[PDB]
């Protein structure tokens, strides 16, 4: 069983309680702030290279190193549910213009194909994973909602306080993380795919 916050203020109190203990360095904070402004670019290059960073320019590779190492200081004290919303391309380029019916519902053919592609399988994410403690407005209107079951002790950082650019109740997960997709179902709407996944962890564990 995983904590799932039902109230923003409670989520904030929990997050703050974790954040207070991090003791991030100035450079770690700067790297994280930068991330909250530049996630698309950093995560894009990570995905482009399937996690390989030795072609990254000085600034980016230093930021990656700082980010990676910051997770030594940022752990969840508790089994926690984390949320993110995704657009169709998350399922693969073949879903990009294909997932949605003209009326805004998820196409059931596309859905079954996505289920075939992903259900009961591990998925490796090369980028860092920006999530939220709750299904926030930022994510809640997207066609794919992922609920991550994140185990006690896992690397996970509450970064909402660190940056004005941070998502609402943002929890950052380390890059190169594997999660296992346990369940995929349509919302009662028919307008969203709800994915339930168990976070397994990151390959990125600097001493």
């Amino acid at each position: 069983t995983y904590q799932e916050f039902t109230n923003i203020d409670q989520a904030k109190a929990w997050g703050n309680a974790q954040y207070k203990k991090y003791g991030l360095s100035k450079s770690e904070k700067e790297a994280i702030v930068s991330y909250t402004k530049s996630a698309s670019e950093i995560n894009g290059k990570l995905r482009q290279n399937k996690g390989v960073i030795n072609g990254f320019p000085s600034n980016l590779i230093k930021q990656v190193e700082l980010l990676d190492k910051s997770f030594n200081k940022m752990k969840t004290p508790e089994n926690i549910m984390l949320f993110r919303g995704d657009d169709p391309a998350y399922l693969g380029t073949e879903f990009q213009n294909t997932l949605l019916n003209s009326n805004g519902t998820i196409n059931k053919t596309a859905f079954e194909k996505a289920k075939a592609k992903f259900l009961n399988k591990d998925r490796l994410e090369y980028g860092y994973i920006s999530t939220s403690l709750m299904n926030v407005s930022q994510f809640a209107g997207r066609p794919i909602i992922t609920k991550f079951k994140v185990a006690k002790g896992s690397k996970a950082g509450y970064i909402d306080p660190i940056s004005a650019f941070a998502g609402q109740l943002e929890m950052l997960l380390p890059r190169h993380s594997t999660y296992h997709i346990d369940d995929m179902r349509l919302s009662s709407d028919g307008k969203q795919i709800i994915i339930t996944a168990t976070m397994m962890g990151t390959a990125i564990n600097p001493k």
């Binding site: 290279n49 399937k50 996690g51 960073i53 030795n54 072609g55 320019p57 590779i61 990656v64």
Partner: protein, 170 residues
């Protein structure tokens, strides 16, 4: 002579498979992606006994200090992409830029390698665009398959020849 080769290229392009095909004449599938290893074997290169050293880089955790170190020590580079992955071809410019930044020598022994030539049916990168880039970079382009062995020995031996030529002065 010891010719120090570094494998570079995005995850999944076939650096490990190519290395193991060259080293042990075997096609090794799904070699641990984040695992790096160094290899060394004696070969006869144009009549002369030499040793090749290959660093099969993982690269996912090779921070500035690490990659700069092995770029500096490396004498020649196999810059591998997969012909079935345009993103991996795009990334070759990045590896080369970072190599050039540390070595400060545009004449660094370097081969552009388009791997997975057995997957013509899934090709995303045109031979044209790859050859054009190779020409632009004043390097050779070779299409390989670690699966079929296609041009695998060639890329290593050609690179060694380049390292040997570079060593000829001094």
């Amino acid at each position: 002579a010891l010719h120090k080769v570094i494998m570079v290229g995005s995850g999944g392009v076939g650096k490990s498979a190519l290395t193991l095909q060259f080293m042990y004449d075997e096609f090794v599938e799904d070699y641990e992606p984040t695992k790096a290893d160094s290899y060394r074997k004696k070969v006869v290169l144009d009549g002369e006994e030499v040793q090749i050293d290959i660093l099969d880089t993982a690269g996912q955790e090779d921070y500035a200090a690490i990659r700069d170190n092995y770029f500096r020590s490396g004498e020649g580079f196999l810059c591998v992409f997969s012909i079935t992955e345009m993103e991996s071809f795009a990334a070759t410019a990045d590896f080369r830029e970072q190599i050039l930044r540390v070595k400060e020598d545009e004449n660094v022994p370097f081969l552009l390698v388009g791997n997975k030539s057995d997957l013509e049916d899934k090709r995303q990168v045109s031979v044209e665009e790859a050859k054009n880039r190779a020409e632009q970079w004043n390097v050779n382009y070779v299409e390989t398959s670690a699966k079929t062995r296609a041009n695998v020995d060639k890329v290593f031996f050609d690179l060694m020849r380049e390292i040997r030529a570079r060593k000829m002065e001094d």
